[PDB]
Amino acid sequence: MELYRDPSQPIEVRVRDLLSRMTLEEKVAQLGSVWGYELIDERGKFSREKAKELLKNGIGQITRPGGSTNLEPQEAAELVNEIQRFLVEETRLGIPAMIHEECLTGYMGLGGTNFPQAIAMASTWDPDLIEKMTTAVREDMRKIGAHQGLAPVLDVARDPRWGRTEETFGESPYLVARMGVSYVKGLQGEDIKKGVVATVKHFAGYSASEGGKNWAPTNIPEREFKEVFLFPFEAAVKEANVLSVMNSYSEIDGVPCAANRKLLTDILRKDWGFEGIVVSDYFAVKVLEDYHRIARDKSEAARLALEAGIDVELPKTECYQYLKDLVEKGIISEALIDEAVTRVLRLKFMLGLFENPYVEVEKAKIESHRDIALEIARKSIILLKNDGILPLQKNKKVALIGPNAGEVRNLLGDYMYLAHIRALLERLKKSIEEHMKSIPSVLDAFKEEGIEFEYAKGCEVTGEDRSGFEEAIEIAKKSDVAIVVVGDKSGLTLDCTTGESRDMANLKLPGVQEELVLEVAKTGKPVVLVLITGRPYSLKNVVDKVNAILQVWLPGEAGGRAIVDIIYGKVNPSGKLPISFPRSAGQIPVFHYVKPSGGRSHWHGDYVDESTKPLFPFGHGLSYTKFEYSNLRIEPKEVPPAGEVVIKVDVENIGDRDGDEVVQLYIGREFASVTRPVKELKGFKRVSLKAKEKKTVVFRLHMDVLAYYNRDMKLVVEPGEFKVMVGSSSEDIRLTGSFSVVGEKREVVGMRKFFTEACEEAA
């Protein structure tokens, strides 16, 4: 047999052999893609007639065979097996396809669990739980023949106007990086032939667009770029061995990321050693012409993207077909095509596809992971305020009010299939409506818990109709407590208030929801405000008028149960904010790791009309119990520039309810050669404490973790003092101390540690 077909040969040998056998047309085909829906008949069965035209010379990827066809898992598996058999048996060289799907909050197709949104995952501060989640998603994906998931999003978000805030892990490069590495490790596992390629996106800067506007310029200078935006991707590449990266739609300072070789090749491949594939964001190659106006036709767009380092044009071949013409016309060298093809073929061999590209359809039934979803939902909800009203007693009569108390659709995030696919909106409309039925409501959770309540919708999520207010106020007046549940509808269409393409300039709760809360509060009845939202909203006008506030980031299918569990104290809330909540849009940005001159206006401190401090800081989240921190140890007190310090604190649950605390480590530095954050998150640990239990939390902090870029753009650790601040939020610091680095400034070269190790031991 040909060497490439022989599994006893090393993958490099099989790649070289296969590349040597391919025509230019076959090479270019491996750099493109076809939609799943382009390969089916009207009953969702594989169409050989359509394949003969689209797959005749092979293909790089199939885009969303499940997510784009509305097929159930076993039908999707059957379609993928038929695609693979056509490629294996009816093309000259028999190269199988790689299949991708969206999977941010679980496989995005019919039959897959809807996990809480990414911003909720981050709010758990529980990286191991997120690894458990993506290990389950891995199995769901492999069952249907999918090899690559387009997640996680490692964009660092400090601008809550942006509609994709909900898909991020928030404002902190450290927390984003740490959640990202766990996410990747769960999806990929150790041997990718048994796992799913993760795709970190959107490389890089995409969350910092001008004015918070989707695709607008992301104009970020170099040190901030390296330390804030690139850092999580760097960790994913070097520590988690991530196998795919997708580029950003935006320009950085005049250069679209899809046309930037300095970014997609020089940083990602040359400096960091990435060995996987770069896939385009959808249509990102074509819109170098149509949107950014830097390519005069599809062939120039193709050339810019290939030279930049995009290996696969998604979601369908459009410009990359012209790479054949560019070679034949002597505009680009076939060697450059070979380099991209080599990367794609290597990964296909690594995924085991030339040994076995099929799946057992009989096993393609995806299992529910409601259990994991509920654990994430229960740990992600944040208690922002509580004057003591929560937890509620079960004998109190409740007035349950607001659009998000009644409508299950609004629990869903923008990459949860039954929200996402609405962007296409009769057969599909009916299928969505049917599937929606199976997801539990907030109403259902209250009824299941046996609470006596009346429900009034109050108002819609959008619009200005206040005609439902009277009914809501009337039920409030006759109740013991009003629970007002307000917030977003997430997705990609005009009727949505958050999600990709739905950016919110002024951060007011949508519609007349704010006025609804305030009218209810005017009754004088105690008010629990529950925000079911995808972004921070300005709560300046309601915070002081309500008794408690729960932030529930778009929780997906487990949301109702977790909310009711928390309200009644069956679960003690333990989520912590992974992004600052501004007092108002005009305060943007607010974030915890400002420099000494950031987060204030000099010399009066505040704006004329507003504090410079967020309403709720990074790391904030209350509990139904109290935690007492004591006995800070920092050893040794002097370390050399590649040494390690060990920081320990004792934490005791001194209250009356069991509860988890997220202990946070912040590090500050002054008198470096550049300015540094007054405090920045550099470690954390979720610790479970029974009432009256005490434990020790231990952080092992290598100096590599503290490295920063100097005046000459070198990554350094300089001698001097580092401040250690340990506490329950970035403001609620409980114990502070310091240690010194002693010795000559160190340039940190090659591989280095990214993370503090965090453990618990007996006190």
Ligand X SMILES: CO[C@@H]1OC[C@@H](O)[C@H](O)[C@H]1O
Subset of residues 245 to 264 that bind a second copy, contact rule: CB under 8 A: 249-256, 262
Residue of 554, 575, 530 lying closest to 123 (CA atoms): 575
DSSP-based helix, strand, coil % in the chain, nearest 5: 35, 20, 45
Q: How far is the CB of 697 from a second copy (least distance, A)?
A: 29
**Cβ-contact 155, 168 below 8 angstroms:** yes
Q: How far is the CB of 588 from a second copy (least distance, A)?
A: 7
Kindly provide the b/e burial profile for residues 450-466, where b requires at least 16 CB atoms within 10 angstroms of the residue's own CB. ebebbbbbbbbbbeeee
Q: How far is the CB of 754 from ligand X (least distance, A)?
A: 24
Subset of residues 275 to 334 that bind ligand X, contact rule: CB under 6 A: 281-282
3-state secondary structure of 576: coil
Q: How far is the CB of 623 from ligand X (least distance, A)?
A: 35
Classify burial at 626, counting beta carbons within 10 Å of its beta carbon; exposed 0-12, middle 13-18, buried 19 or more.
middle
691 binding a second copy? (CB under 8 A) = no
**Cβ-contact 125, 462 below 8 angstroms:** no
Q: Which does 150 bind (CB under 5 to 8 A by kind): ligand X, a second copy, none?
A: ligand X
Q: Candidates 470-478, 587-595, 615-623, 731-739: pick the segment binding a second copy (CB under 8 A).
A: 587-595
Subset of residues 385 to 444 that bind ligand X, contact rule: CB under 6 A: none
Name the token pair of 679: 């405090």
Q: Which does 601 bind (CB under 5 to 8 A by kind): a second copy, ligand X, none?
A: a second copy
CB closer to a second copy, 216 vs 654? 216
Residue type at 683?
G
Q: How far is the CB of 180 from ligand X (least distance, A)?
A: 15
Binding mask 181-210 for ligand X (x = CB under 6 A): --------------------x---------
Name the token pair of 591: 């974030």
Q: How far is the CB of 523 from a second copy (least distance, A)?
A: 25
- Greatest distance between any 2 Cα atoms in the chain: 82
Give the separation between CA 524 and CA 455, rounded to whole angstroms: 18
Q: Which does 163 bind (CB under 5 to 8 A by kind): a second copy, ligand X, none?
A: a second copy
To the nearest 10°, the Cα dihedral for 532, 580, 760, 653?
Answer: -70
| Single residue of 37, 358, 568, 709 touching a second copy by CB under 8 A | 709
Q: Which does 600 bind (CB under 5 to 8 A by kind): ligand X, a second copy, none?
A: a second copy
Subset of residues 85 to 104 that bind ligand X, contact rule: CB under 6 A: 102
> Over 398-410, what HEC string results?
EEEECHHHHCHHH
Q: How far is the CB of 669 from a second copy (least distance, A)?
A: 9
544 binding a second copy? (CB under 8 A) = no
**Which residue in this structure is represented by tokens 């299941």?**
448
607 binding a second copy? (CB under 8 A) = yes
Q: Which does 695 bind (CB under 5 to 8 A by kind): ligand X, a second copy, none?
A: none
**Cβ-contact 114, 557 below 8 angstroms:** yes
- Interface with a second copy (CB under 8 A), residue total 77
Q: How far is the CB of 596 from a second copy (least distance, A)?
A: 5
Q: In what order do the strands lie in the sheet with 98-101?
A: 33-35, 61-63, 98-101, 148-149, 197-203, 244-247, 277-279
Cα 84–88–89 angle (5° rounding)? 115
Q: Which does 281 bind (CB under 5 to 8 A by kind): a second copy, ligand X, none?
A: ligand X
Using alpha carbons, list the distances in angstroms from residue 727 to 576, 581, 702.
Answer: 12, 19, 20
Between strands 694-702 and 746-747, the pairing is: unpaired
Q: Candidates 62-70, 216-224, 318-326, 695-703: pick the segment binding a second copy (CB under 8 A).
A: 216-224
Q: Could you count the other beta carbons within 10 Å of the beta carbon of residue 168?
A: 27
CB closer to ligand X, 115 vs 125? 115
3-state secondary structure of 738: strand
Q: Which does 282 bind (CB under 5 to 8 A by kind): ligand X, a second copy, none?
A: ligand X
150 binding ligand X? (CB under 6 A) = yes
213 binding a second copy? (CB under 8 A) = yes
CB closer to ligand X, 246 vs 484? 246
541 binding a second copy? (CB under 8 A) = no
| Single residue of 464, 467, 604, 744 touching a second copy by CB under 8 A | 604
Q: Which does 201 bind (CB under 5 to 8 A by kind): a second copy, ligand X, none?
A: ligand X
| Single residue of 161, 346, 686, 734 touching a second copy by CB under 8 A | 161
Q: Which does 52 bind (CB under 5 to 8 A by kind): a second copy, ligand X, none?
A: none
Subset of residues 482 to 501 that bind ligand X, contact rule: CB under 6 A: 500
**Cβ-contact 56, 120 below 8 angstroms:** no
463 binding a second copy? (CB under 8 A) = no
Q: Is the peptide bond before 589 cis (omega within 30 degrees of 0)?
A: yes
| Single residue of 584, 625, 729, 730 touching a second copy by CB under 8 A | 584
Subset of residues 264 to 283 that bind ligand X, contact rule: CB under 6 A: 281-282
Using alpha carbons, list the distances in angstroms from residue 133 to 10, 382, 412, 553.
Answer: 33, 20, 17, 17
CA atoms within 13 A on the CB side of 632: 19
Q: How far is the CB of 113 from ligand X (least distance, A)?
A: 19
Q: Which does 568 bind (CB under 5 to 8 A by kind): a second copy, ligand X, none?
A: none
Binding residues (CB under 6 A) for ligand X: these are 102, 150, 201, 281-282, 500
